[PDB]
């Protein structure tokens, strides 16, 4: 029921900026296709460091995915790290959404939340395009996150829907 | 009227006969698995022993395509038995090679609304799951009409398609 | 409720447009030849019409099975015109032979039971009516999947011609 | 008594659906323009207009509000993907073209039926200008037959008044 | 309430000319009507009510009857009327005036404010046939417009006439 | 629910018109006296200046019985105050000094059931109520006919030597 | 709900066996179309309550008649209860033999018809009800129990009615 | 139907009664331990010459003995109740009772005892007996024109006094 | 279970029981008072005069209320038996003699709890003083101790200041 | 209000001769004490007697008691009320101090505040030096308690004090 | 709970208010369709260099920015009758067109939250209140030390070109 | 407490900060002996003004004056302030900053004041001001959209102190 795969998994409703754009995006919405949202604790920071998966992210267009990223920082505080090129401490431009959980509730709906530093974890989340929870990944906030590996758990779970 | 695509495929359970002897199922067992339902009008009716036969040569590749059809009835588990250990030739199913279930209560051809009023037969009906249990498809002929599996076939080769792939232009 | 074949089939009242024209349509008015109805998505998007434009290529090989083909979807009906209007080009439906019924009042899609209350547009469905004004096959499918016109022509024939020459022995 | 006309006094209506804005996708519940005037309008149907003014009008005529802290929006019953080819129209042809007002409209013809314009005859909308000061509650109801067309200035004479009314209010 | 749908009937006390009559919606057949709600009689005037008076020439020609209705009475309505305007009053309406003690008319057009034993302000358009044309509803504070109203009338007659012309324009 | 003369009398909050100004007022501002409450069609009518105006003529032979009076209507809570400034030779109230109580929604006047719905203008009414709170006197006529300050003055001595003297 | 009565209504008609003049005779509301019924109620007979009250219109009974006016009396006592209580003396406490016509509430048809009667007691409040000519209410005076009544204001409400009703019917004088 | 039977719970009642021309507040359960003989009538000064009233209160001294109290009661109101006790026999009263005179304008206790007549809104006579525990046991209805015996109640009661005892 | 906070503003607590009047019983209760003023006092017990006693006092003192209009009403958590007793004693003896009030027995001491003058202490009562208008309202409360006294002359002038405000006004 | 227990503790200032000090009930312990109330402050209307308790107070001392006035006013308010001159009318002039709580706690401690106004009425009590409460008695908002009255039963209870029941 | 928010609405208030002398009960319904500003003090008859001094002047500089001006304390009606009808030369508050609103239930006291049960007074409170029913602004301060007039006007102001242009 | 009072205790703040883009630790009982204002705001790169959060370092001259610690709070992350900080407020930013900025990603403190919003992460604009007793003075609380007043914040503070000598 929580944070277990093969049931319903919590729906959300996302306030963010996509290409330099707010845009107003929900489960509800993405679904129909592959998603997989993996947070973060906060924006800035130092691993990939959410670099990786932006240029890449088109092999998941190759295998019909949703790639999306968020933090307790709010659209305001992603905007700032999107315009902001690479070179000034920035990620240029954005080839993937960036999320913004500022109510702090999506976080806690995947127990991804830490009372400590009061932020998102690394948790990842792959979801099909059933609206179900599928594989469950969460890594410490220290700690980066796999890419290839992550497209790799994806075919597979494609395989098994497929055969 | 009621039934949708969106609408997650109903329980039925109950009774059937599988290779051989008696086996309990349920639809639960099937997820992950494709799932075909057709109905028939009874057993040993004359219009013809061949499409309900039809199923039963096309298993090995469902089996390999990752998906199992049942065909279902309003008559009880005794008939089936009857039904089946007799020769094709002598208007027999002779051991047809998919799971037979026989409904009884009427409750799963009243659950898909496949029943019939003027008697108490039921309309002949086909219904495909995908592998999380949802309903995607809904279709249903008229009593002396039979079915082709190259329809079914072919629209489960594009449920397959639509799940992984979402939605891209043809072929 | 619970439509079914084999029964009688729901009076249906509405505008639609043919040949970019403009002319009222019920069921009683093409009483005695077999039609099908057939509803779609929302027009001026990604769509199926594998399908659409088969039919539309196709609708000779009704007349010749003595059938009339109908599109009926809930869109607009102005919108229609244009979506016929757009060529094949663009992806559009460029011209047609094929009748399309407005169901923007949505009676007629409560009516076969396939409008969904969720998009508010409805979902693919088929139905075939005899001569007698009676309901002969439904097939419901899913938006992502298609259709095959052979099937359709295949379950066609074979109504006709129990309508004709009854029963017999081998089938399909 | 609600249900039937909406009254300038309580809150008005609450609507969630999919629009088009400079030629994309857009989603907006009316909460986001929270602490701003707003102006909703429809228009029974898509590819069709009576006279220019009401859509195109205020679209060009844009530039008012946005100096008023008001926005303009369009609503009916046509699909999303609907308005995006609409919005790809040209001028010469009589199409929309440039969009500098969010067209929204729903499928579930849920808005229009709460905001009282709908009707089980066309089974689209009536066309009809209604205003949401910056806090949201009720203000203006206008309601006219199809044919019939809406002024700008009609607009731009009762804004003013009810800017003025909040930032002064009635002195005779 | 519709455009298209007609009207309901009305019926009551009327003040014309300082006299006492009965107005029916059907006594205008054939004559556009406009009426029109206020809060309330003795609501002190820019000329909103005494605007559209002055203007009433305006309407006839369109062949278009105006008249000022709210929840007072042929009493209080006379009475206003009777005073020079000069301070206070109204002065000669040339327009009927209307009173409904029942609301029973307010209620009838879904103007009535439950709150107050008022009606909101809003402008009613009725065809010769006795169906309606349109529904305008302000907010109590707003005032109005006569040249809105002089458009409106002309529009729901050029479409009703010469008809709707869809091409160009 | 049958409406009998002596029972809690119904709470009802309107507008009055007291001294040129508008005070919004309830019972338990004139609990501890005695109301008198009566009920007059409607205002710049066509006769009987006598009648409403009688009281504001003597104010004494109430207050001086510790008894207030009420005059209350369905009308403009703005009319009121027009119809009071207005005078006798023209036949307006003339300053009334007794508030003048305007009924608007309507709550009020079918709350003591006096509401009128073939017309919709109130018929004529008068009440008394004990200090209490709770009622004493109900009256009713046809809109023609009016009231003499002789009886409502008896009526009123009627009450103050019972609840001292009870019946002897 | 009956709830409270505006007096525009046809008045209740009232049917049963009366008290006249010493006898019992049955009366109603359409024996007396074209007169004014002046009908009071008072809570119980035999009772320390004063008569006067009540002998009050008794004995005035010669106002009415040259004025064109009947009264009558009822109570929630009986018709036997009546006869006895005007054949006391008022030496005793009676009534002096007093002539009105005396109606009892019995299956208390006439009390709920004007609203006058009460749940907790069953002893009628004190009602007045004015009845033109034509059997139509007119005025309502209902006062409390201990409170009594007297007909100088009850003339007064008859020769407004009477001269309203003769001209002026719109408008008034007082 | 909606009846009411014996050997069951009497239907309760309470009210103003007259004890030697006085007005005194009693209730049925106020008896207790005594049978209670509750007997009605049409009304007040609606008989002729109610040789039958007068009766019980003359023999009424048995019932003392018998430990039972028998009551008369109507719709009339407790001051209907005096007057004609406090009349003398000789023409309009009963003079003297030693049995309670009861009055209920209410007229729950009649509707109560089902001798309550929908007709001239008076009730019928009726005849309730009633042990100790309260408890209703005999049913007795008869008519206006018609008048009762005391020995006929006198056996019962003994009858009844008996059927207990043994 | 905080003190009873009862005041002279709401309507006063119900008080029934047998009441001993004139030497014979009756059933009292605050319902049968209406147009009348009550008066109701209480105290300690019966048989108990001790300093204070103003009960054979209030007896010669009735033609003082009487012209008030006001019924004076006993009361106590005694008996009606105890009260029934010292009714028909004389005087002389320390008796009571002819009542010209009401004499009321509490026993199950709820009407005395009702008016918060009940003590738990011991089983007797306190001296009340209670004034109570005909519409059944409280115009006034006293509570004296055992040991102290009430004013007869003091309650009659409480009738005429309530009454007062009543008839030519308060403000 | 169970006159048995030892009565409540109140607490707060008063007003002591054109100035404002502090004054506790144990303050008056060995001494006894006479408290009561009223609706509020600044009132022609009310009983002038409230001063005939000030101006006959020499009486009370002399029987060795204490008298002090609460309300549900304020201790700036009965200042104020204080200083006005009989010509007014509104105080006249009270030796008696003014104790002003404007937590309505003493009030309320007595209970005869009351919720249908946001004040308290006009109460009575009596109290014997140990801080026990004896006598119990609450007036109407409109009658006053009278100064007779207090004397008579304030005698009452040292007569049964010193001599016994 | 805790402090109250701005954005939602104004808590439903009564009572009843001195004005010109005379006792009105009055309702914010009432003085809806325009602003009100409502302030608290301790107590009446109080000398915060001056406030109700200061208020029974510029009152206009308000009035012509649409504003309705209030006062509230915890003290009894007639505790504001005395103090303003007294002249200012002997301490009352002379004609103060400014209505005076009491609580003696301490129902608007415990309504905006503004009040301590410790000193059994209120603090001052300060709060604006849009044509709407909405609130604005909250000032809070003590005893000791008030508020500023001409201020009031600016944040009145604030909100307004906020409200007008968004801006 | 539930609701918070000038009266009692300033509700009690640690966390993160930033000065001369570094990392410190601070809270309100090292602060003691003087007076500490806090403001509030919504979030990092917000829009209506630069200028808001840029008067108080601007000012901080006004409250050395008058021996005041001043402290910039809001729910953002500890490194949403150094990017918003570097950014220029020709860029949109500051650049040059002396107030520390508090991040409060517990929400501890925000709520703790009842500044802190339900629907969303964002805090109303609020101010604090605390004696060198670590009690409370006054609370004021704006919108997300309106600004606040610096020459209104010492109004209040300098009197505060004005009673602390002259009573």
Redesign the interface.
Known sequence: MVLLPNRPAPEFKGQAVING?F???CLK?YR??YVVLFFYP????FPTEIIAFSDQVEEFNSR?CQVIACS???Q??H???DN?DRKS?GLGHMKIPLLAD???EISKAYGVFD?E???AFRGLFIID??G?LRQITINDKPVGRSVDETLRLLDAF?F????
């Open positions: 754009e845009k107003e995006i919405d129909g296709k906060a924006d800035f920071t019909n307790t920082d709010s305001y505080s905007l700032a790290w902001l401490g500022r109510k702090q009372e530093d009061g932020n395009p059933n179900i494609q098994v829907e497929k055969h």
